[PDB]
């Protein structure tokens, strides 16, 4: 309380039985290296209505893709509001929400969702409460919040398969991230979070790369050595919105050969929380948040071994500026 | 451990932490087998319980499947043994957050089930933990089993469709699907109401399930009509129930022959089983804690590609039979 974004928890909000002002935010990842070839990543947030004649079922999240870093950004956000979108349930291996673009301004025509006229997304990652969405009827999605992020050719989402690579000659590099969330203590959201005296916070565990267990001359890397490599890697970590709430990791120092594919050639990686942990992602649709702590953790490199081998904590990383505030249009 | 008030079933404590602020072990058995015996028969075992932090603090409800043992012994003694298990857990991650359960002690009757044979299982956390965001990614944690749910069925009947055959799409196919609504017994004071549909009777949950594929043409030439498809589907003679094999799941059965496209969506004995925790993790975990039964199941035709679904209204065809005997049943103390 009281940013207007809190309503994006619907229906898990106090007044759930029975448009207030369209908001927008703009985040630059690197305000010093602005280019016309940078991409503007655009996320919508809003509400699924049943067809007043109009019933509020759920908050929902719709990624548009990107557009070149061209034009005035606040007007690009205004165009996101005049978009007309319909959605139905569907399902493939899981429940899907199919959104259809009915109409959209010309400025949005080069992003993937608008170019394709549709988007089909995992419903548990994109809808607050899919159990609430009828399998039939006439449904509508109303965009009320627009969030744009300008990102330099840091392009860098690790392909999912590479996040699942594993083996007994490897360690799994991972981050134990805790996130403070601002919330009304009488909100039902509060139920699923931890309580400290510093406040309510969420826990996230995130796999960030891989390392070798073994020397150039066969066995075997000492912990001290491993931690020196981690230290040199000199991590910084923030919260962002880049097609959904996202964890940004930046190495300011060199990568080892195994860690190298897990970052762009400029030392950055972007992790969509909605794949990492879908319940944390949806919380952050609605509540302001910032990193409480980030500890870097080493675990064995197969889940079988994770089960029998204790984790090695090393150090904290800096917290690198994790984000924009929602504002009304003026 | 901790408590829950006398009015409601203990199974309702499996909502934790989604509860408004004494509990003994329980079991339930579902029989999908015939009354006679065979060694095609297996006992699938699901456990439900709580992850505690030792540093003794209750964090979240959780579910862990163990796999299956042969149908031998006394099933009430098999269930009792499930409580003797020692299980720790910790977070890990690959592409997604993982919960890793480590079986530290297990009784001899379980030694052949998958999770006990290996001494661990590593599961998608959002599907197996009510509130993964409340679990610390370090610290001392234990999984304590309090509910054990057994399902006896022949092995050949638990035909779960592999992910890829469920994504198979096509311009000249129809998406055959089920629109499933589920009545759930829940108290109105319970926080869980928020995410449910208000019924004239009570509360329901909506679930939309992809079930097979059908051709837009008749073999030897197009183009199948409103009426012929109805024919084929009524001939399929679909029946649908709930159960707890591999967690809360939807059982789907066809009495009739399958067309060439539908075949692989059913076993040679016309059965299929869809874990809800894949279709919808949120409905699945509701089902941990509340009793429930099918409210209604309509058969639906959508286009064969997602692109086309988006431009095409759903055509509702018929309802299915509801196996009134197969429901999300309640537990009994030992």
Swiss-Prot record, chain A:
InterPro entries, per database record: Matrix_C, Matrix_N, Matrix_Paramyxo_C, Matrix_Paramyxo_N
Signal peptide: none
The organism's place on the tree of life at top rank: Viruses
GO molecular function: identical protein binding; structural constituent of virion
Chief location category: virion
Family per similarity comment: Belongs to the morbillivirus/respirovirus/rubulavirus M protein family.
Full protein name: Matrix protein
């Amino acid at each position: 309380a009281l940013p207007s974004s809190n309503l994006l928890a619907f229906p898990i909000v106090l007044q759930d039985i029975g448009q207030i002002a369209p908001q927008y935010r703009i985040q630059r990842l690197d305000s010093w290296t602005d280019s016309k070839e940078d991409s503007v990543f655009i996320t919508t947030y809003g509400f699924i209505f049943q067809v007043p004649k109009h019933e509020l079922l759920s908050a929902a999240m719709l990624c548009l893709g990107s557009v070149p870093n061209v034009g005035d950004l606040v007007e690009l956000a205004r165009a996101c509001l005049t978009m007309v979108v319909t959605c139905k349930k569907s399902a493939t291996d899981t429940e899907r929400m199919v959104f259809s673009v009915v109409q959209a301004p010309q400025v949005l025509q080069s992003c993937r969702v608008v170019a394709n006229k549709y988007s089909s997304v995992n419903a548990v990652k994109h809808v607050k409460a899919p159990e609430k969405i009828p399998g039939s009827g006439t449904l509508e999605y109303k965009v009320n919040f627009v969030s744009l992020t300008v990102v330099p050719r840091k392009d860098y989402k690790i392909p999912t398969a590479a996040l699942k690579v594993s083996g007994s000659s490897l360690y799994n590099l991972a981050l134990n991230v805790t996130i403070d969330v601002e919330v009304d203590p009488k909100s039902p959201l509060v139920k699923s979070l931890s309580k400290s005296d510093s406040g309510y916070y969420a826990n996230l565990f995130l796999h960030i790369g891989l390392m070798s267990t073994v020397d150039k001359k066969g066995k075997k890397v000492t912990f001290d050595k491993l931690e020196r490599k981690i230290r040199r890697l000199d991590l910084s970590v923030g919260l962002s919105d880049v097609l959904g709430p996202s964890v940004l990791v930046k190495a300011r120092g060199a990568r080892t050969r195994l860690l190298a594919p897990f970052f762009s050639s400029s030392g950055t990686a972007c992790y969509p929380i909605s794949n990492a942990s879908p319940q944390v992602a949806k919380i952050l649709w609605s509540q302001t948040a910032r990193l409480r702590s980030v500890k870097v953790i080493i675990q064995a490199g197969t889940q079988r071994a994770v089960a029998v081998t204790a984790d090695h904590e090393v150090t904290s990383t800096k917290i690198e500026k994790r984000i924009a505030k929602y504002n009304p249009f003026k």
